[PDB]
């Protein structure tokens, strides 16, 4: 409510259905995440624990699109300051762990695009509803850095090592339909009904047994928690790459609209 | 057989094929498990070790159906006394661990339905043969308690976390055909061919190399054993829920044939 | 290198594309591996780290076929002396860990057949390209020994435990297309395009950020590394079976071209 | 902080030295923890992250004594309702994880007595300074329930399994001096110098490298985090015992000041 | 029980104290274990589960000595047959796992000497009482085989890796006094008081809360279970060495009372 | 031999006793490690596997001193180049894993000083012999970076978490005598007897069973391998600190021999 949006600019809160706290986030184009939004999306889970009445959380990006991930501004801030780099490191860790350790089920209405941090948040949710034509991509390898913001924690237990290595190492995108087929996400529906179905799912969870749902989510999530070191190591390695020339060429290439010429 | 059937009321033993020990269990309607059957299916594995000639075990529910899980009577016996609750706790643990630690391959002929403890037993088996129309459902969340009788030990390494969370948190049933495609079970055949195929598989295993099969099953099962604490925690959390208002509402709604209205 | 070819008989080295080191191995029928080849394929990884300019490694069997695994000769040698059995134990371990611990991405062009050690190598690679008609089979249970040369380390996180147990315990072959559907491998293309597609993949990898690729592959492989004891145990158990009556019968039957009659 | 003390009755905050935030807590006899205090000590860690300038935290019980653990009132409240039992479950979990997950080093001035939750808090701290005469005891087995509030997460990696089983299963108290020798705590000093030494330690920590300390503590604590399921299971089993006859007799015995007569 | 004594040649059962089931085993000189005693001590745990009234188990070697481990006869039987070797493999596994998974606390009165399998059994017990002069030695390296019958499962979490590697790799004996100080065992008392004290401990445990003790032991033992693969691998490696020349030399030297001359 | 001496400047090789390969390293004062020596000590293990006849490795620093760790030159090189930082990252990882994965037992004659990388090498060895007065110190917190070059992998399983956190977070040195008492090292002898005793230990190991020792070491080391992610994460966090102001001040204050004043 009021106490909360002021602290997290870019996040809007509403109750579309009884017990369903809907969080709408707004970034730059395709909801690219500026530093303030990244920090907000990673830290809000702390305070949400204090909100009474929440039986399910629904995540949605403003403008009918989820998120293309971290913005160029955020990336450049990270490369310019050690203090910023480490602050974002812990934010990146909580962007994934936040949803996982939140007591109530989290549903993500993944519209049109989910890349980098956007995909991290989409997959950190308990249930993700995507459109058959949604574009899902880790994207770090194209940028010149390791896939350390979620992939190593979540992908193996979602689609297995073969499909994970193929799509993470080659930067090969997945359509929402293909993603559901691999088991990366629970459902793939007509693009125009993504929000509709996600709300339906969220409402259904809000109708379920609160304590039993919390305990079940918590117990299942220990599977991910057992591999937290694996995840944090991938994140640390990714951040070590921020001072490397591969990231420099990756950004430069992306700005010059030319394929990267990695050294 | 002789001494076994005497000590295990509800269980019938036979050798339909060479080296194939077939256990046919009988419960109530749809083979729902009363206290004695639940305990029997959980403890029989310890005594089967002494049965000479067993090269494979075939599990089948009497009357053309596997099992709808624990009966109302069992649930009532648990919630009524501490001593009964904890007795059932170890039984629930052994219902899954029993087949896993049994040296020989176990095949389950899953006909028509497998719910709750019924699904736990079916998925604890090394190879489950289901009918394309078989109904597979954890169903704990609908009852009002955490999915702690097998789901947390088995589902993640069977279908991945996305499909696990989707079907376990929402109590979304799976048909045999859909379950095979997700990787939850090995084969989904025509409904009237389930037993026939299951028997074929059991006989093939019985014709295989005993020591090699034992060692391969044993080695593969260490994957599950590495997550035993995860499993037991889920079970303990479920049982802690037996004294809550959610189970009271779920149990009441079920017997009363109406949708649950959780607090 | 010119020195590598001399130290690794049976291995041919070439650079089909920039930064792509292609290793073509030659064995006996269907490239079955004799002692020298098995040892070379397991230990070459240690020396490749010294070859400058390697951004990706492409594996291919000579003659349009990957590998049917260890040769009859290798197996008999192992059964004949403790010295050879243990020498091969460490080679078998390295055949899988070599690729996994090699810094650069490894691609396998799996043509027509991949059995035993052949499948182990194909699956240890980061990305495997198979043909729709390729035949993949663990094969150990038919031979009379446990599936300990790779299956327990890689299969669970690739296709799940249900599909792993079905194909491993029954020795049920998979077509390349089926393997791709289960998640065992990334791509299944037309048989005549396997090499072509594999080379394309390797070239794409060679064009990516090498540090980012190394770190991503390394972080992901920790998932496999966490289960190394599980794997080495299965391997040890397999080798303990080399002095058993089951391998004797398994070998006798295969050579006599008759069904095995295990004790 | 004033707001901080208002939300956590029983907790006093001060800055005895630069960067050293001292939290003094007060309970009942020997600082036994009432419901409000137990929850406060468990939940305060979340809000402490908001306090800037904290480089180290020093824990101390008021009145020259640390804590005898949960009070009779708290225990009875837990036995009286499911709602309270589960509320306290999550608090007990946080009482240990809170200090572990707090970024800054935590020092405990363990004076005279540390039992149950008191010991849990003292051992969850990064460094514990005890007095040669301080008395440390888990105490759950004498109470009639499993040692589930910290022992299974911390003791094994502190003193080894032999000493852990001996003191936990027999309820054999440890002097501060013996505890140091076993490795349960870092320092054991003259009773009169416990606070002095603890403050000295906290001050040294506050003078060290903030980021380096944070990261070192975090990396080391992953050792404990890897066994979280083990801990939570012990906690769940302990709580399942709250409805048993053993706890009944356990409390009856102490309140009547007579040796327990377990069934 | 008459039935137990009838089925377990070499084992004597008695109730020296209420709820304390005492198992006195008799082998050859220094209770060296012949094939039947090894198997019996390994399998008895499965049958003890059905003995009503057991609240604690006390293990004692007949004739004032625990055990020097496996006899030359057992070692030769293992080296002479594949079937015998694998039979003993599972027995060796159960000798350690048996006590660990037995629900009630197990106390070992370790008099004078505990070597090899004798040490395995003593350390698998929950509480071991040794004499200050008792000799504790793994001894496998002297025999010419890997320390795989318990050391890899137990020692690291008892005394740390440095002391484990030192005493295991060098076959450096430990007196009971030195072992207690390292943390390998809980108590070291006057040699003549070992049984007396062990009985005292067993009686105290029998007077404790049954359910609470079971759950605490179970929860703590998950620490060991998490490393079951590690242990089984060490065991399998040890057994693969039985066909080697080092065991041949160690065995020959031992029987010829001379120092081994390893190849 | 000649080929090794020719390839590793800074390292000297000799056979003081049959089967004992002694590696003496020479750095700057107190054998501080320049870039070349650090890489040499980290990579030599790969080539040592090729040397025939090695039954045990003995490590010793030239001039009667082990090593003060990385030299100022090495630290400055890391700080000034991303390329240098990451190359040392993998070297640091190998400095510890090299000895751990080497097949033969490794003994370290730790004379006078072992700090940073020096202590890492000393503790990675299977058996370390120190002098009663030897100074052992991690030392990273004093430098301003996390203790990530070995501590998080080795210390918990050597001395337990309490002693590890105390010495690592406070930068508190340990005398060889104290280190042995804690279990960090196997033996602490008179300073003058260090090399003599270390050689005696190495010789004894060379007289032991080669295969059995390899297998025992390998199996025990899986305890460390299971926590590799924990170790690498700590190493990565340490290296992320190289671009921070804490390291800058740590070096500055160090070179200016004044107490550091961290921000």
JSON list of C-alpha atoms in Angstrom, two decimals, chain B residues 46 49 82-83 86 90 93 211 214-215 218 222 225-226 228-229 232, chain E residues 46 49 82-83 86 90 93 211 214-215 218 222 225-226 228-229 232:
[
{"chain": "B", "resi": 46, "resn": "UNK", "atom": "CA", "xyz": [11.87, -55.51, 5.18]},
{"chain": "B", "resi": 49, "resn": "UNK", "atom": "CA", "xyz": [14.57, -59.41, 1.65]},
{"chain": "B", "resi": 82, "resn": "UNK", "atom": "CA", "xyz": [0.23, -38.28, 19.10]},
{"chain": "B", "resi": 83, "resn": "UNK", "atom": "CA", "xyz": [1.28, -41.93, 19.26]},
{"chain": "B", "resi": 86, "resn": "UNK", "atom": "CA", "xyz": [4.20, -40.58, 14.82]},
{"chain": "B", "resi": 90, "resn": "UNK", "atom": "CA", "xyz": [7.65, -43.59, 10.10]},
{"chain": "B", "resi": 93, "resn": "UNK", "atom": "CA", "xyz": [8.72, -42.64, 5.35]},
{"chain": "B", "resi": 211, "resn": "UNK", "atom": "CA", "xyz": [23.94, -58.28, -9.22]},
{"chain": "B", "resi": 214, "resn": "UNK", "atom": "CA", "xyz": [21.01, -54.35, -7.84]},
{"chain": "B", "resi": 215, "resn": "UNK", "atom": "CA", "xyz": [24.14, -52.22, -8.06]},
{"chain": "B", "resi": 218, "resn": "UNK", "atom": "CA", "xyz": [21.45, -48.83, -5.68]},
{"chain": "B", "resi": 222, "resn": "UNK", "atom": "CA", "xyz": [21.82, -42.35, -4.02]},
{"chain": "B", "resi": 225, "resn": "UNK", "atom": "CA", "xyz": [19.06, -40.48, -0.73]},
{"chain": "B", "resi": 226, "resn": "UNK", "atom": "CA", "xyz": [21.07, -37.25, -0.97]},
{"chain": "B", "resi": 228, "resn": "UNK", "atom": "CA", "xyz": [16.39, -37.55, 2.31]},
{"chain": "B", "resi": 229, "resn": "UNK", "atom": "CA", "xyz": [16.51, -34.70, 4.82]},
{"chain": "B", "resi": 232, "resn": "UNK", "atom": "CA", "xyz": [11.65, -35.98, 5.86]},
{"chain": "E", "resi": 46, "resn": "UNK", "atom": "CA", "xyz": [17.47, -55.52, 11.51]},
{"chain": "E", "resi": 49, "resn": "UNK", "atom": "CA", "xyz": [13.88, -53.62, 15.77]},
{"chain": "E", "resi": 82, "resn": "UNK", "atom": "CA", "xyz": [33.59, -63.01, -6.01]},
{"chain": "E", "resi": 83, "resn": "UNK", "atom": "CA", "xyz": [30.35, -64.06, -4.39]},
{"chain": "E", "resi": 86, "resn": "UNK", "atom": "CA", "xyz": [30.32, -59.01, -2.49]},
{"chain": "E", "resi": 90, "resn": "UNK", "atom": "CA", "xyz": [27.07, -55.50, 2.05]},
{"chain": "E", "resi": 93, "resn": "UNK", "atom": "CA", "xyz": [28.13, -51.68, 4.93]},
{"chain": "E", "resi": 211, "resn": "UNK", "atom": "CA", "xyz": [10.88, -40.64, 21.34]},
{"chain": "E", "resi": 214, "resn": "UNK", "atom": "CA", "xyz": [15.20, -41.51, 18.74]},
{"chain": "E", "resi": 215, "resn": "UNK", "atom": "CA", "xyz": [14.45, -38.27, 16.90]},
{"chain": "E", "resi": 218, "resn": "UNK", "atom": "CA", "xyz": [18.03, -39.76, 13.76]},
{"chain": "E", "resi": 222, "resn": "UNK", "atom": "CA", "xyz": [21.68, -37.39, 8.77]},
{"chain": "E", "resi": 225, "resn": "UNK", "atom": "CA", "xyz": [24.02, -40.26, 5.81]},
{"chain": "E", "resi": 226, "resn": "UNK", "atom": "CA", "xyz": [24.81, -37.22, 3.67]},
{"chain": "E", "resi": 228, "resn": "UNK", "atom": "CA", "xyz": [27.03, -42.33, 2.48]},
{"chain": "E", "resi": 229, "resn": "UNK", "atom": "CA", "xyz": [28.25, -42.26, -1.13]},
{"chain": "E", "resi": 232, "resn": "UNK", "atom": "CA", "xyz": [30.49, -46.73, 0.05]}
]
